[PDB]
Structures are given as C-alpha cells and as structure tokens.
Amino acid sequence: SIFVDTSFWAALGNAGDARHGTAKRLWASKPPVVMTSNHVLGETWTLLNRRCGHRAAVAAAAIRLSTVVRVEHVTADLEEQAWEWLVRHDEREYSFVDATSFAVMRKKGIQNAYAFDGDFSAAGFVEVRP
Amino acid sequence: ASIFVDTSFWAALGNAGDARHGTAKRLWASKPPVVMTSNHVLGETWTLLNRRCGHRAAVAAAAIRLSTVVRVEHVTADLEEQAWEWLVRHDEREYSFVDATSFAVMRKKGIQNAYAFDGDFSAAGFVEVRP
C-alpha cells in the first residue's frame, strides 16, 4: 500500500536531515503494508555512509532484515521496463533507481509513496504528506 | 583475460568532456575479449551521465545492456546478501553499495582486473587497469 524511497529512508535515518521530523510523523502513521526495493536500500546505504558514517549506514542495511518492511528484489524484467521508460522520458531528469521504483509501484499497483522532493509526484505517484 | 567495468570508467568513456575520456578510450582499445559489468553499475552510470551531460549521453549507457559483446551480470539476491554482509563488516573505508556488489561479482567470476578509476577497487584488493 506504500512504497518507500531513498529520500525518505535518508530523512528517517538522519536526525540532522531537514525532513527528519516529517519522516518520523509519517512513519508513525504508516499503513500495515510497507514496501521498498533492493536498489533503494543500496542507494540509502551509500547516502547515509557518506553523510553520517558506517554505523548509521548499517541501520539502513538492517532494513533488509525487517519482518515488517517488504524488500522487493527488482527483477531483470522490471529493470528492462525501467530502462525503456527512462529512454522515453526525456522531459525530466530521472535516476535509474527512481525508474525501477516507479516500475515496482506500477507492477504492485501502489500509488502512495513515502518520498520527498518531487520525482515521484512528477511520474504520477503521490508523495504522502501529514 | 577478463575485466569488470566500473561506473567510473563508463562515465569517462561516455563523456567526451570527462578529464579521463582520452585515457578511457585508450584503455577501451586495448581491452581483453571478455568484458563484464553489472546491472547496478549500468544503473549508476545512467544516473551519473544523465546528471552531468543529459538524456542523450545517458541513453548511450542504457544501450550497453543491449550489447552482444559486453556481458551484463544481473546481481542475484544471494550475491547482494553477500555484498551487504561485506559492507557491514568492512568499516575500515567508505564503500558504496554498488562497489560492494561489484566486488562480489568479481569474486564470483574470478575476475581480478577492473576498468575503474579513483582507487576503491585497488583498496579492495583488485587491479585497476592503467594505460
């Protein structure tokens, strides 16, 4: 029912993030079903490791172990859909991870995303706010 | 005999304005017959080229997945899990997730040589090929 992006994980995992407060409130009122991807978690590791350090990044690594967060391994076929999508959408600057995230959400029938800063909204999803 | 190609190399090769573009082209011309990369690397390469150059340059990187010459490894769930354990264990130096999966692919495939710059592969015990 909700897909979680790197931008959200990074805000939640970094108390110094400007959107940390918003992320915490959203996390408190999340639905029972919460999804993310291997690509997102990997990006989150890299971001937090660079910004906060190894210990903070390990927190991101541990999400893959969660019993209450569903971590989808993006298949080769979903990556292919994301690639074809990226090639078509030249109207805006989209990252590969975001493209795979969009493909996962489309496949799973999810429109609500836990995410910040606009890419998901532009691609037709809802960036949930309090 | 074989090489693994990192984002740092793809980005230099696919961007004529990259400071290492000339070096990349020379290395590309003297590469061995077996050339491998990964889905994570190609993805990271798209994002980097799309940001630095724009959509057209990035599309060139996307096409590498269509190559009959470059082997593109899709990192399996098992290999990713090894990469995560590796990341958690190796706190001696800042490593990215993509690098960790790259290292895991090279270990799996028995590859020692990487087309890469900036020394992360060297630090991890592989060889970054130089001209």
Curated annotation (Swiss-Prot), chain A:
Domain PINc per the UniProt entry, residue ranges: 2-130
First-level EC class: hydrolase
Binding positions for Mg(2+) per the UniProt entry: 5, 98
CDD domains in alphabetical order: PIN_MtVapC20-like
UniProt GO MF annotations: magnesium ion binding; RNA endonuclease activity
GO biological-process terms attached to the record: rRNA catabolic process; symbiont-mediated perturbation of host process
Keywords from the named record: Endonuclease, Hydrolase, Magnesium, Metal-binding, Nuclease, Toxin-antitoxin system
Activity control note: Inhibited by EDTA.
SUPFAM superfamilies linked: PIN domain-like
InterPro entries for the chain: PIN-like_dom_sf, PIN_dom, VapC20-like, VapC_family
EC number(s) from the headed UniProt entry: 3.1.-.-
Required co-factors: Mg(2+)
Gene3D superfamilies: 5'-nuclease
A Pfam family this chain is assigned to: PIN
Family, as annotated: Belongs to the PINc/VapC protein family.
Function recorded in the entry: Toxic component of a type II toxin-antitoxin (TA) system. An endoribonuclease that cleaves both E.coli and M.smegmatis 23S rRNA between G2661 and A2662 in the sarcin-ricin loop (SRL, E.coli 23S rRNA numbering). The SRL sequence is highly conserved and is implicated in GTP hydrolysis by EF-Tu and EF-G. Acts on purified ribosomes but not on isolated RNA in E.coli, nor on a shortened artificial substrate. Upon expression in E.coli inhibits cell growth, colony formation and translation.
Protein name: 23S rRNA-specific endonuclease VapC20
Lineage: Bacteria, Bacillati, Actinomycetota, Actinomycetes, Mycobacteriales
Gene behind the chain: vapC20
